[PDB]
Task: structure prediction
Amino acid sequence: HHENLYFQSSEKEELFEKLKQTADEAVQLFQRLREIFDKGDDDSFEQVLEELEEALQKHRQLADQGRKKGLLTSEAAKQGDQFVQLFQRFREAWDKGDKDSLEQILEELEQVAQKAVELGLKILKTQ
Ligand SMILES: [Cl-]
Result:
């Protein structure tokens, strides 16, 4: 029989801890990606880019899991869609060698990332 995750305090807490753990790893990788980009190490850049893509995908799957189990769709979903779309453009600029678009998108990604940190952690307090 079905019960909303909202009312399963023990299982919901475990999901929320995994959400914060994967967010923390993705945010750490995003900050290292910025530092590597400034240093200009290609191999290190591509490595951290793949690790960040994998960490972001795991974070987003956990968010989808909570919503499938009953939680309402929060404003963090749409704001995270904005980050994912910009992040895919960033990766596509790197694939194509468009360093012009790369640096411009990265500045915009830094602002969207800070909003995602603030919005996601605020919303989690009352989900
Ligand atoms: Cl959500």
User: Anything to note?
Assistant: The chain has one domain: 9-124. The pocket of chloride ion is lined by residues 63, 67, 73-74, 76-77 (CB under 6 Å).
